[PDB]
Amino acid sequence: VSAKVLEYKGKKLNFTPEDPAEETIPADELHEHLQKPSTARTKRLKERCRWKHASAGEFIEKSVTAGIERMRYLTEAHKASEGKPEAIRRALGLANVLNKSTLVLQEDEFIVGYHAEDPNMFPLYPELSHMAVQDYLRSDYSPQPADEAAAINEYWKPHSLQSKCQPYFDPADLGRMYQVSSMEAPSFASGYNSIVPPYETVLEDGLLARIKLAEKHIAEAQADMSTFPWNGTKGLDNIAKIDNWKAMVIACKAVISWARRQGRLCKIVAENFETDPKRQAELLEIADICQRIPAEPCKGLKDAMQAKFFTFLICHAIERYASGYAQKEDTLLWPYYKASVVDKKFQPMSHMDAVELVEMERLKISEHGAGKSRAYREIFPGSNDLFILTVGGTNAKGEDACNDMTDAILEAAKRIRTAEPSIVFRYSKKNREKTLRWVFECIRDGLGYPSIKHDEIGTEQMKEYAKFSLNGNGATDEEAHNWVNVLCMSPGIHGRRKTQKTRSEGGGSIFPAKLLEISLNDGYDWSYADMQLGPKTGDLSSLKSFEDVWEAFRKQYQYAINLCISTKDVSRYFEQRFLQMPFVSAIDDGCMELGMDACALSEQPNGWHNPITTIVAANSLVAIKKLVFEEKKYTLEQLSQALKANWEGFEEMRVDFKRAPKWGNDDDYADGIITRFYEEIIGGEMRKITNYSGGPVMPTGQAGSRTGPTPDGRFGGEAADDGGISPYMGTDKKGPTAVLRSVSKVQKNQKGNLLNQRLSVPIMRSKHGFEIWNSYIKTWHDLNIDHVQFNVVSTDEMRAAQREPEKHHDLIVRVSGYSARFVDIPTYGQNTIIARQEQDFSASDLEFLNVEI
Amino acid sequence: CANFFPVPKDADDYEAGKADCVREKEDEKGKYWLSKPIF
Ligand SMILES: O=C(O)/C=C/C(=O)O
């Protein structure tokens, strides 16, 4: 149902595929002929990949289950370390885990390492959420022995972060949050988390150097305490500093020992087990890498990749759980790519060798068993975890940051075709065409990534937050260009310093759609939770004029958002006191300089919260204002009765509300209300909150089934919200450019807003594909829109994938904020993807984008 | 399948009598090796 031909500027455009071989391949199985692993090795590694993704509450691979070794050795260390400073205890816990852990080496892999005792397993985190561990104990994936695991969880229960935080909130308030209806549950209750590791420090300095810095600081602090005359008001400050630095040393020494023991495993296998001489030599190379790295600075690309993977394991899995894969990978790896491929000074490599190495990275990430809670698996069907890396953008001078490492990263993604890790590309007008073409190759292949973030919008955002630095050491104007997405949508500093260390700083969701429901029912959530979800802001009779609805919502929003942030800052309070991260601290230049824990020191504020299903609440208010207080065709009681009846009757009434002006149609009346709602209520009331780091808290819109019937013409539990600031599914009816004009109207008090858009297959895969896409991106950027990501996949192939799943394994599509294999998503999710409007481009659309052919 | 490899006395993790217990395993995916610290 998409155009194959278009007349534009007196030129007839033939939307025929570039490669003539594509005309031969059936359209309903196109994406099964796109993968092309750079080597036989990476082809084997994909075929035998130990996938860790799950859907409908169970892992797709049968051997996937929880490990116990992390739980066991963390418990052992904690019992033994009683009485000692908590930072040192935490370091000792890490050290014991790393010292005693069974290590893993697999065939064919070059990047080595793992975070549990068995390559099919994932570790658990009793020190975080007792409830999360309890869930796994009551599942088919319980750590074994079950009795020991149960005893471990009971031991940790009063020590857990969850138990630390809960007493400082009304149990009724937490009960409301735990319903996950109007508010996402606080991170301390689920154990969910994120982090931006200071990789640059590890790769540049090595861990031995960090140990010597810490030991030097210890000596200086001890000397200060011994200096006459003693000053009790200043001298005691050295205690917490010394504690932190000693903990840094313990942590770093253990990571080095762990890495070297991993290298010893490679050497042992090469000399006693492996029979292939080619693999033997390779294992010995890897052994040497592990011996030097990360103890020493990296010298080449192989060093850097192994360092980065080791560091990822510690920061995201072993020291603590953290979702994500935040990093500026091209900029981070570039000096080591330069050493290896360009100058060939150390670990000489070809560009294709670099491509293969990135392929192997993507596969290792694909094998990474994530010990996130079961509840946070269900939200993302077909995925193992959210891994989002960032490339592109600009350097400190505002010049193009794109390079050949960027291209190697992008080609590897196009070749190996794995759902994870996803990629964010920071788009600037400065970005070279050579790299943009690689970006387009991935997108045109239907991968759903790279997702495009506005470079300037993120950079300015870093400058704005930097103003609120509590120690006046926020990001400089130059450092402001050094930013990555933390998870899906939110910008944050990357580098040796000032990076975000916890989801407590920013992250977490709130749901304006539900808050609108309970506004029209005295704070009572009848549709889902069946309880009092918010304040008794008055009955239906009290609500007079559209402002009362507009003002009752604010009261609900204020109550909800206040809990959303305070629960995060209370978590922060206890994270730095009982969940110290001395490894992360050791590799942060600020933490090392000041002798502070990673969660204590916060030089760059980055507070945010995610308003989700804002569009649904927005379109609902437009239909309320128009059809109740400006036409009086219906009363509040008639609407409320209809909503509670899920419009069993009132079918003409629902259509009347459905036909009301929507978002993403360049409709002046509809956009007028939604623009103010985004900037006055969603952002305005939220900005009034100051978080732990002394900065304001600003909204990050991104991504419904728990939302009851809303005046925007939605049936009960209808999950068809595209996400973020993107138009509701089937609401947009004036094309892509009209959608693009609506979104641009939101400019104030926002930190970010996700935009899903589906583009036509024949256009994108034609020779004209790149020109139109590049012009679209050009226009999107100049409209100052924060974000956009694309879906390039035909309905026919998805339908065929539903009928014969075993013939469409390599089909990858984009859902909310991540990509997944289509055959791994339940039918209901699949039908939701199909329902998304595939935007076609007319002559009028192309003229608006200022395209040229 | 349990092989013991005494930790070298110059290793960072060396202790008296410590060894790496290295076992080879293979399932439906492929081959791998496990190294567990023992005494
Ligand atoms: O942590 C979150 O909830 C979201 C993060 C992001 O969108 O970057």
CATH number of the domain that B18 lies in? 6.20.90.20
Q: Which of A700, A751, A754, A816 to mutate to test the pocket of ligand 1 (most atoms within 8 A of CB)?
A: A700
Q: How was this model experimentally determined?
A: X-ray
d(CA A587, CA A558): 38
CB A370 within 8 A of CB A384: yes
Does residue A490 line the site of ligand 1, with CB under 6 A? yes
- Compute the nearest-CA separation of A109 from chain B (Å): 10
B10 touches chain A (CB under 8 A): no
Chain B residues whose CB is inside 8 A of the A265 CB are 20, 22, 33, 35
- The answer to whether A103 is a known ligand-binding residue is no
- The answer to whether A595 is a known ligand-binding residue is no
Which ligand 1 atom minimizes the distance to the CA of A503? 1
**Secondary structure of residue A73 in the 3-state scheme:** helix
CB A458 within 8 A of CB A328: no
Tokens of A1: 């149902």
Which of B13, B24, B33 lies closest to A261 in CB terms? Answer: B13
Distance set, CA A151 to CA A67, A317, A836 (Å): 15, 22, 48
Does residue A502 line the site of ligand 1, with CB under 6 A? no
Does residue A606 line the site of ligand 1, with CB under 6 A? no
d(CA B22, CA A235): 50
Minimum Cα–Cα distance from A46: chain B residue = B29
How many beta carbons lie within 10 A of that of residue A208, not counting itself? 15
What CA dihedral angle connects A137, A579, A381 and A721, to 10 degrees?
130
Tokens of A42: 């990476």
d(CA A627, CA A645): 19
Tokens of A268: 């042992």
A680's CB contacts (< 8 A; 6+ apart) are none
**Secondary structure of residue B6 in the 3-state scheme:** strand
CA A754, A758, A759: angle at the middle one, nearest 5? 130
d(CA A523, CA A525): 7
Minimum Cα–Cα distance from A50: chain B residue = B29
A509's CB contacts (< 8 A; 6+ apart) are A183, A184, A609, A610, A611, A612
Name the residue type at position A497. R
User: CA nearest A705: which of A826, A544, A590?
Assistant: A826
d(CA A686, CA A510): 11
d(CA B7, CA A601): 39
Whether B33 sits inside 8 A of A48 (CB atoms) is: no
DSSP letters spanning A158-174:
GGSHHHHHGGGS-HHHH
DSSP letters spanning A355-379:
HHHHHHHHHHHHT------THHHHT
Which ligand 1 atom minimizes the distance to the CA of A509? 3
- The answer to whether A798 is a known ligand-binding residue is no
DSSP letters spanning A757-825:
EEE-HHHHTBTTHHHHHHHHHHHHHHTT--EEEEE---HHHHHHHHH-GGG-TT-EEE-SSSEEEGGGS
| Structural domain boundaries, residue B9 | 1-39
Q: What is the resolution of this structure in A?
A: 2.0
Whether A102 sits inside 8 A of B20 (CB atoms) is: no
Task: Choose the mutation target among A49, A61, A105 for the interface with B, i.e. most B CBs under 10 Å.
Answer: A105
Name the residue type at position A609. H
d(CA A699, CA A683): 6
d(CA A2, CA A794): 9
- The 3 state secondary structure assigned to A525-566 is ECCCCCEECCCCCCCCCCCCHHHHHHHHHHHHHHHHHHHHHH
Strands A698-701 and A608-611: parallel
Protein residue with its CA nearest to atom 2 in ligand 1: A507
Does residue A461 line the site of ligand 1, with CB under 6 A? no
Task: Choose the mutation target among A265, A283, A291, A292 for the interface with B, i.e. most B CBs under 10 Å.
Answer: A265
Name the residue type at position A634. Y
**Secondary structure of residue A601 in the 3-state scheme:** coil
Which ligand 1 atom minimizes the distance to the CA of A700? 7
d(CA A83, CA A246): 16
What's the structural domain count of chain B?
A: 1
User: CA nearest A258: which of A195, A306, A192?
Assistant: A306
Q: Is the dihedral of CA A51, A54, A60, A66 positive or negative?
A: positive
Which ligand 1 atom minimizes the distance to the CA of A490? 8
Q: Which of A490, A568, A754, A789 to mutate to test the pocket of ligand 1 (most atoms within 8 A of CB)?
A: A490
What CA dihedral angle connects A203, A206, A207 and A212, to 10 degrees?
-140
Distance set, CA A221 to CA A88, A89, A338 (Å): 17, 20, 40
